Design an enzyme around this catalytic site. Structure first.
Site, mmCIF file in Angstrom:
data_model
loop_
_atom_site.group_PDB
_atom_site.id
_atom_site.type_symbol
_atom_site.label_atom_id
_atom_site.label_comp_id
_atom_site.label_asym_id
_atom_site.label_seq_id
_atom_site.Cartn_x
_atom_site.Cartn_y
_atom_site.Cartn_z
ATOM 1 C CB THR A 30 -0.574 0.024 1.150
ATOM 2 O OG1 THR A 30 -1.839 -1.111 1.229
ATOM 3 C CG2 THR A 30 -2.025 0.917 0.998
ATOM 4 C CD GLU A 63 7.724 -4.959 -1.889
ATOM 5 O OE1 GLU A 63 6.800 -3.953 -1.546
ATOM 6 O OE2 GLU A 63 8.540 -5.908 -0.986
ATOM 7 N NE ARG A 113 3.435 2.690 3.747
ATOM 8 C CZ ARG A 113 3.498 1.410 3.567
ATOM 9 N NH1 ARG A 113 3.205 0.679 2.969
ATOM 10 N NH2 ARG A 113 3.370 0.832 4.527
HETATM 11 C C1 LIG Z 1 9.224 -4.801 2.753
HETATM 12 C C2 LIG Z 1 7.468 -4.410 2.598
HETATM 13 N N1 LIG Z 1 6.767 -5.484 1.409
HETATM 14 C C3 LIG Z 1 5.772 -5.502 1.325
HETATM 15 C C4 LIG Z 1 4.493 -5.029 2.144
HETATM 16 C C5 LIG Z 1 2.853 -5.240 2.024
HETATM 17 N N2 LIG Z 1 2.439 -6.355 3.249
HETATM 18 C C6 LIG Z 1 2.203 -5.377 4.825
HETATM 19 S S1 LIG Z 1 1.520 -6.897 5.128
HETATM 20 C C7 LIG Z 1 0.956 -7.656 3.599
HETATM 21 C C8 LIG Z 1 0.342 -9.146 3.391
HETATM 22 C C9 LIG Z 1 0.306 -9.857 5.367
HETATM 23 O O1 LIG Z 1 -0.814 -11.113 4.613
HETATM 24 P P1 LIG Z 1 -0.429 -12.343 5.228
HETATM 25 O O2 LIG Z 1 1.442 -12.123 5.697
HETATM 26 O O3 LIG Z 1 -1.293 -13.668 5.012
HETATM 27 O O4 LIG Z 1 -1.463 -11.764 6.553
HETATM 28 P P2 LIG Z 1 -2.668 -11.449 6.450
HETATM 29 O O5 LIG Z 1 -3.545 -11.877 5.603
HETATM 30 O O6 LIG Z 1 -3.042 -9.775 6.690
HETATM 31 O O7 LIG Z 1 -3.457 -11.814 8.194
HETATM 32 C C10 LIG Z 1 1.544 -6.896 2.701
HETATM 33 C C11 LIG Z 1 1.628 -7.437 0.825
HETATM 34 C C12 LIG Z 1 5.832 -3.925 3.537
HETATM 35 N N3 LIG Z 1 4.635 -3.697 4.650
HETATM 36 O O8 LIG Z 1 4.822 -3.699 6.254
HETATM 37 N N4 LIG Z 1 6.437 -4.040 3.842
#
Ligand SMILES: Cc1ncc(C[n+]2csc(CCOP(=O)(O)OP(=O)(O)O)c2C)c(NO)n1
Ligand SMILES: Cc1ncc(C[n+]2csc(CCOP(=O)(O)OP(=O)(O)O)c2C)c(NO)n1
Ligand code: SF4
Ligand code: SF4
Ligand code: SF4
Ligand SMILES: [Ca+2]
Ligand SMILES: [Mg+2]
Ligand SMILES: [Mg+2]
Lengths: 1231, 235, 118, 117, 58
Positions: A30, A63, A113
């Site tokens: 995001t 990333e 961001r």
């Molecule tokens: C280095 C980095 N890349 C991408 C992101 C974005 N991000 C944060 S939480 C997330 C998805 C989490 O999925 P999951 O681990 O399955 O937990 P959830 O389904 O929400 O319970 C993403 C793509 C962050 N955010 O600091 N940091």
């Protein structure tokens, strides 16, 4: 040619990026996610790029992974992009040096961001792009939706010709999520500007075995420096290439740009230098102020890198006597921020007039940067001229802030209509607004702008819309503060939020409520609002949208009525065209199911227009009596900090209100009591079997079991009904299931799972329950929790424990929160939690709401969120600290044993030492030390006394979602589990990246539909469990609450008690999965997930192996054949079936086959008699040894890399052959 | 007391680092590798830091993993250090913002090394430390073997008292590998310079279920900016 | 025209073989998350791991590929955890070709693996 | 492709200094650790032998399918599929839906029946 | 007549301590940077020093 379009910065830039790229290596973060998702959508729809091809898009594991793939594709001759931000961009940094170092035409589009420091923020600022300013990337800024489109085109073209990679960036949210009516170019026009010669050269110099070269050599001091400087010619030309392309694009669009552009008075004395969306608002203000004679101006920086001083001066008015550089970042300890420093250098280098430069910081984390603030900055240059200031906050601790006068006049262009809408999440307000932007934009010459503010709350959250329409371009990149039209779509907000703040006189305010009568209106409508409605002669309108909707049959959905309200009373369009237009769109949209659904909407409109009449109020309101303050008791922190924030007043809190290190106190959610559930459970004590399953299952801790002894119910309300406690251990106790109606979210799991056929829990409308239950819960909350009566880890007993995570902002019926909640009922008082970023970190700690709380003794989870990628390592670190500090303690304890310490102390010390790593004994003996050593402050006993918070063994837990565990943090999780140390990892598997929008993770199953897997994921689910089970010494288990609460507790107790690494994977239902019958069926779904064979439960315990038994135990039965129904009951599978029946059938069959094979394999595992023995440790001793000591041949090379202080001795380096060969040779030469 | 010894920049600073830390999470990268290996050998040999304890050293899967571990150890009240450079320091950047953002007394010792661009280089320059200048870490340079020992000591003492993490750096090879006859301080002397109350406060504000708090919240536009400026008095 | 464009792309005519080389440190540790993800992608790429059971070039530091009891930097008393089983781990996917080789034991088996893997 | 342990591990390990130094410095621990290695490889080999004799193996689809077309996981869902967060916000989001705050479909259904009016 | 200013604490950059080490007789000063930031108007230390002189405003 051209084409009008209304979109946001993201889609506007992805429009160009798709066209100009052959490849995209992607990862979601995001606010940049939308770009990659649009690209994927377009690729699937058949959209072709300028080469007539569909874009080749792949999602990586992080990333860092994407940046590497980007580098690979470019090195291999393909034009490539990626979209990223904040933490994501940081991970690309290493590859950025490589990509610019190798002169590759890559283009990164980033939504600028904030970077996480004292706290995390998904909002906009330049902390991230400035962090990469030294990678060698060219940096081009766009300051608006229209500009994002143009700069994205310039970046790609310039990159192709210059061979210098570009980073095109625009402000997170402020530009990426703002929607505007802009003009885009066709792909053919973009194509016509590509430098064909340069493109052919790119492909010819690329990696290919038919004409290979070697890239990425390792260089010594003799040539590295020269190699680094050889690219100079390329960087000297990029600025001219960029200016050239701004002109070529301008020849097609009519919109011209320069490296640095100037706006304002030609003879301005006071000038601002800024970058990003702030320039738009700065200019709006300039036009306003300048027309009054003020001599101010602005320099918009487009190309931030390379920084061409010449172009900067080309835009600087010679009359400027004072200039302030605005930097949207904070670099602690630096003499000044990035842009300021660059500008300073231009002046000293020029070595002529020195016009006094000031540095100012603004907009961190999308902090508002309004016209009043621009005024402050301009007044500062003619007034105090404070340097290194901040604007947008009140810095009362260091005094760096500029005061801001909000009485500043509205500066929007003549004829701009400004609207604000306050809605309830899921009520359709946002959707209708976005639709209203299209309607108006597509059918008038008006420019349109929309921006939306949301909630940290996931359910029943507030949404507040800001829309603007005008005859002149909209440069207002700040929220609306003086609305012409205000709408409150939720009556409840009326008396809790400042709805009319700033509303213009004669402005119109529409409200949705059933208070049609002057009596009701005067009763529910607060006094301040009446006073405001009156004194401003506002055009007030009430409309019972819920009633109208029900009447015409829309079933109570108010979106269509409020939409009508907007079209009729906003004043953006004349009634005739307005209502006419709305109706045409009714047919355009909808029309999906006959004319029946259509008519209901047409009808809704018609009846809405009729009922929408100016509510007439008495002149008495002008002074309606102020009310009292029936405000409940609560924290001073909650009183002074969190409530102000929860009521949208956070912006007024001065920096003195916060902790320097960003920390927050535990349990602030206790006082939120939102009361947003439509229906809450009602206990029916006549059918209750006193099992405690309802409380165990609640995603919010909204069910409080009560076990009291008659003495405690003395002053209990008359209706505090309590059954006589069942069970031989609870004889004299009274039992009661108290419902916390205000904290309940109305999901329905408790009621759906309540055992007896004649339910003991039945759902009822909130209003029919609060009055009786509010004072009841408030009474029960005062009854001591009976934690000693039953086993802590038993189903019934655990609910008689204090839950340490309550009322979080998780969605209603969230499948993750029930799990962590019970975990805390078992180890809460002695645990550390290292939480991966994701839903669990968002519901777990979104300021100002903190769901984790302390128990009666003030003990509770020590909670922390480091990053998304490092949760396991972060926890391992906490574990290392405990290891070192408690080893210190043990050391001190052992020394005290050999001193004249009293017999009792020694006895306790000896007891602690023997039970140091045992939760029970360490606490038992530690508690005696706390007593015996109380007050002690000298010598050993004193040191030991000061370490009491280390006495009882701690429980280190790592919480995280599947995305974290299977993808980005997998490398870290793997390494930490392999360390063999005592940590506990709890993975809440939602089979998708939930938090960020439901993107596919390697945990996503075959055929499930998710972002970047929109035709059904085409690879099976990654088997993390079987992978870590190959270690042999790691405890592995899978759980599913709905299937068995007892197995869950058993796993919790076994995993935690295992003196080594533990991995627990739980099946967590999520709204992203789209459960067909509601999230209230979560427990049922978890149950079916196991019975169907989809999610088999098991336990891999290494201590069984240690004792000759099989470590693997199966806990669920073979597939019962319900898969198909299990899958078809979820939209993530069913949408595929409705859209691609053939493939969907195939994918679901494969799934049945995969789970069938897997169970069979698990069966043989459980029946095997071949397993490795286990040993928690055994050995060590003092002393080390180097791998080269006493070796017969050289053990290290002649490289600078292996050189060590002690190396350099002579050794046989294997250039004389083998030991025998040397021997045999010596023999053959004798002499 | 004081003690004359001939060693290089690497071991001269590791001499101090070992004494001033309780925990170390590391990853090897030329030319800083020597420090972590020295520390590991000395702990295995039973050498004592100023707390009379052997150093707790673990090797992670990468520098990113090391930096995350360091963040965790610090957050949990243990004096922690790490040794790194170049590409390795780059992977630590994300956690560096976190470590300074939460005002932790961490200390990074880096052998300033070139970053890989048109080519890779294990040799010395400031391309790496400059790449982390905006992370909020204080940055102290030592320009000689003798200075490495002294600045490393200053960095540790100042981080403890100021609550601002420090990055002590010296030139890769040119200083890390140059050997010189220098003077070092005994561990007791180092211990006597430590601010005991600051150290105790660091322990008491650390993560511990006995007296919890939550750190690493997610913040909206309403308060993020104010929160970022709250640390000014410390800097 | 068309024929011209086709002509200019002759260096793409024959199918290419994409290979990823790396030691055990890279494969079992630092680059494992990436390796795991790329193998799970299902695409046609070949990875060849030269396992020295230690981080060789930088000076002999332990890696998760280092076996039980082997002495190496950070394993100065012999590594006390066993070798990570990378092979069995990626074999769980089912759609990834996995093989182990050792030239000295069999050159023929090494050649066969190359042919099958590629 | 290879055969069961032939019993020469000990000489194999002792012929390498990375194992031999341990023996020279810490005899007791080293013998334990070399014995542990012989145990590990023994178990592993038996496991590999079982893998070779199992008749339980996953099928295998090389690829094929997908084709033009993609659908959002939220399309046609009975209840809201996204939250009220800025993180899940998308250009096309914003439409009204059942946010699971009224209970299940049957629960809502039965409540209706019980309150009809 | 030449001299050298050795910088020990690079961050936080304290201008006041910098000037306390600068001879009033200095007529030309060159900042040596041991790095390369492609496209920057100058390298880090140089930029920090230029800022000190502009703020001093003398
Ligand atoms: C280095 C980095 N890349 C991408 C992101 C974005 N991000 C944060 S939480 C997330 C998805 C989490 O999925 P999951 O681990 O399955 O937990 P959830 O389904 O929400 O319970 C993403 C793509 C962050 N955010 O600091 N940091
Ligand atoms: C981000 C980072 N980069 C580099 C290094 C240092 N490093 C380079 S190669 C290496 C060991 C390689 O071991 P291995 O993978 O087993 O291969 P090898 O044994 O030498 O054949 C290390 C620790 C640590 N160079 O970019 N961290
Ligand atoms: S309806 Fe849901 S939120 Fe409410 S008490 Fe029941 S389980 Fe909890
Ligand atoms: S689930 Fe039903 S029977 Fe069980 S304790 Fe709750 S209300 Fe009583
Ligand atoms: S895991 Fe799913 S249900 Fe739970 S808070 Fe996240 S989006 Fe909502
Ligand atoms: Ca454990
Ligand atoms: Mg998930
Ligand atoms: Mg190796």
């Amino acid at each position: 040619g051209k084409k009008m379009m209304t979109t946001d910065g993201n889609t506007a830039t992805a429009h160009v990026a798709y066209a100009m790229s052959e490849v995209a290596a992607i990862y979601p973060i995001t606010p940049s996610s939308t770009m990659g998702e649009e690209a994927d959508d377009w690729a699937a729809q058949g959209r072709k790029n300028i080469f007539g091809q569909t874009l080749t898009i792949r999602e990586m594991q992080s990333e860092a992974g994407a940046a590497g793939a980007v580098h690979g594709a470019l090195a291999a001759g393909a034009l490539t992009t990626t979209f990223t931000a904040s933490q994501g961009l940081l991970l690309m940094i290493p590859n950025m040096y490589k990509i610019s170092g190798e002169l590759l035409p890559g283009v990164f589009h980033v939504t600028a961001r904030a970077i996480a420091a004292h706290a995390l923020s998904i909002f906009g600022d330049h902390q991230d792009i400035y962090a990469a300013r030294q990678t060698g990337f060219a940096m081009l800024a766009s300051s608006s939706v229209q500009e994002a489109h143009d700069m994205a085109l310039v970046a790609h073209l310039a990159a192709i010709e210059s061979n210098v990679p570009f980073m095109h960036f625009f402000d997170g949210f402020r530009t990426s999520h703002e929607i505007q009516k802009i003009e885009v170019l066709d792909y053919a026009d973009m194509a016509s500007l590509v430098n064909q010669k340069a493109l052919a050269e790119f492909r010819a110099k690329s990696m290919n075995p038919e004409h290979p070269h070697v890239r990425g050599t390792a260089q010594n001091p003799d040539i590295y420096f020269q190699g680094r400087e050889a690219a100079n010619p390329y960087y000297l030309k990029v600025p001219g290439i960029v200016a050239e392309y701004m002109q070529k694009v301008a020849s097609l669009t009519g919109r011209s740009y320069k490296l640095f552009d100037y706006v304002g008075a030609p003879d301005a004395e006071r000038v601002i230098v800024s970058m990003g969306s702030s320039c738009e608002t700065i200019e709006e203000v300039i036009n306003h102020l300048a027309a009054k004679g003020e001599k101010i101006g602005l320099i918009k920086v487009r190309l931030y890198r390379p920084f061409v001083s010449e172009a900067f001066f080309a835009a600087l008015p010679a009359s400027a006597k004072v200039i302030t550089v605005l930097d949207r970042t904070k670099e602690p300890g630096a003499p000044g921020d990035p842009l300021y420093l660059d500008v300073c250098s231009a002046f000293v280098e020029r070595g002529e007039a020195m016009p006094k430069i000031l540095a100012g910081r603004y907009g961190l984390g999308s902090k508002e940067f309004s016209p009043a603030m621009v005024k402050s900055v301009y007044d500062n240059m003619s007034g105090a001229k404070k340097n290194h200031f901040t604007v947008g906050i009140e810095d009362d601790v260091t005094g760096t802030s500029l005061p801001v006068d909000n009485a500043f006049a509205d500066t929007t262009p003549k004829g701009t209509i400004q609207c604000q809408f306050w809605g309830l999440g899921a009520d359709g307000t946002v959707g209708a607004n976005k639709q209203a932007i299209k309607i108006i934009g597509d059918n008038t010459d008006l420019f349109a702008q929309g921006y939306f503010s949301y909630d940290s709350k996931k359910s029943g959250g507030i949404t507040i819309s800001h829309l603007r329409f005008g005859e002149k371009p909209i440069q207002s990149t700040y929220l609306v503060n003086r609305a012409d039209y205000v709408a409150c779509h939720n009556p409840a907000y009326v008396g809790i939020y400042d709805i009319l703040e700033g509303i213009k006189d004669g402005g119109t305010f529409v409200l949705n409520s059933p208070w049609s009568s002057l009596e009701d209106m005067d009763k529910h409508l607060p006094s301040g609002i009446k006073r405001t409605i009156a004194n401003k002669k506002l055009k007030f309108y009430n409309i019972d949208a819920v009633k109208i909707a029900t009447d015409v049959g829309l079933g109570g959905r108010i979106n269509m009525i409020m939409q009508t309200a907007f079209f009729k009373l906003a004043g953006v369009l004349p009634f005739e065209k307005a209502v006419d237009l709305l109706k045409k769109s009714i047919h355009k949209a909808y029309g999906k199911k006959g004319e029946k659904i259509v008519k209901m909407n047409t009808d809704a409109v018609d009846q809405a227009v009729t009922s929408l009449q100016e509510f007439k109020y008495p002149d008495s309101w002008k002074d309606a009596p102020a009310e009292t303050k029936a405000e409940p008791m609560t924290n001073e922190f909650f009183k002074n900090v969190v409530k102000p924030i929860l009521t949208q007043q956070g912006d007024k809190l001065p920096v003195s209100a916060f902790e320097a290190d960003g920390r927050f106190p535990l349990g602030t959610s206790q006082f939120e009591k939102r009361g947003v559930a439509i229906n809450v459970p009602q206990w029916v004590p006549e059918n209750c079997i006193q099992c405690n399953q309802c409380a165990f299952v609640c995603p919010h801790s909204a069910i409080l079991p009560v076990l009291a002894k008659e003495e405690e119910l003395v002053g209990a309300p008359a209706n505090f009904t309590a059954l006589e406690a069942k069970g031989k251990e609870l004889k004299g106790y009274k039992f009661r299931i108290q419902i916390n109606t205000l904290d309940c979210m109305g999901c329905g799991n408790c009621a759906d799972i309540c055992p007896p056929k004649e339910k003991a829990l039945v759902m009822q409308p909130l209003d029919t329950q609060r009055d009786a239950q509010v004072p009841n819960l408030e009474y029960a909350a005062r009854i001591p929790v009976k934690s000693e009566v039953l086993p802590r880890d038993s189903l019934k007993g655990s609910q008689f424990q204090e839950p340490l995570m309550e009322f979080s902002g998780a969605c209603s019926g969230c499948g993750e929160t029930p799990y962590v909640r019970v975990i805390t009922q078992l180890f809460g008082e002695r645990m550390f939690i290292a939480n991966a970023t994701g839903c669990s970190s968002i519901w777990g700690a979104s300021a100002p709401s903190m769901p984790y709380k302390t128990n009666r003794l003030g003990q509770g989870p020590a909670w922390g969120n480091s990053l998304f990628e490092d949760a396991a390592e972060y926890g391992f670190g906490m574990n290392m600290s405990m290891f070192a500090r408690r080893t210190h303690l043990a050391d001190l304890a052992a020394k005290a044993l050999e001193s004249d310490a009293s017999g009792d102390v020694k006895e306790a010390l000896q007891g602690w030492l023997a039970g140091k790593n045992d939760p029970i004994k360490s606490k038992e003996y530690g508690d005696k030390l706390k007593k015996l050593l109380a007050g002690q402050k000298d010598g050993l006993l004193g040191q030991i006394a000061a370490m009491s918070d280390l006495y009882t063994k701690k429980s280190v837990w790592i919480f995280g979602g599947d995305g974290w565990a299977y993808d980005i943090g997998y490398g870290g999780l793997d390494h930490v589990l392999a360390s063999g140390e005592d940590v506990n990892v709890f993975v809440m598997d939602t089979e998708v990246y939930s938090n960020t929008g439901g993107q596919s993770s390697k945990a996503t199953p075959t055929g499930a539909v998710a972002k970047f897997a929109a035709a059904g994921k085409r690879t099976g689910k990654k088997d993390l469990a079987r992978m870590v089970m190959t270690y042999g010494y790691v405890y592995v288990a899978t759980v599913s609450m709905g299937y068995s609460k007892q197995q869950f507790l058993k796993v919790l107790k076994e995993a935690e008690s295992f003196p080594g690494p533990s991995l627990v994977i739980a099946y967590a239902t999520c709204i992203n999965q789209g459960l067909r019958k509601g999230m209230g069926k979560s427990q049922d779904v978890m149950n079916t997930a196991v019975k169907s064979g989809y999610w088999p439960l098991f336990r891999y315990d290494p201590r069984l192996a240690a004792q000759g038994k099989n470590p693997f135990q199966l806990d669920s039965k073979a597939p019962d054949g319900s898969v198909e129904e299990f899958l078809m009951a979820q939209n993530r599978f069913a949408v595929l079936d409705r859209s691609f029946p053939e493939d969907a059938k195939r994918l679901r069959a494969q799934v049945a086959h995969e789970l069938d094979v897997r169970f069979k394999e698990l069966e043989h595992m459980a029946a095997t008699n071949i397993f490795e023995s286990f040993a928690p440790a055994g050995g060590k001793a003092d002393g080390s040894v180097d791998f080269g000591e006493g070796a017969e041949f050289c053990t290290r090379d002649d490289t600078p890399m292996m050189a060590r202080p002690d190396s350099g001795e002579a050794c046989d380096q294997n250039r004389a052959g083998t030991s025998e060969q040397q021997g045999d040779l010596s023999k053959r030469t004798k002499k």
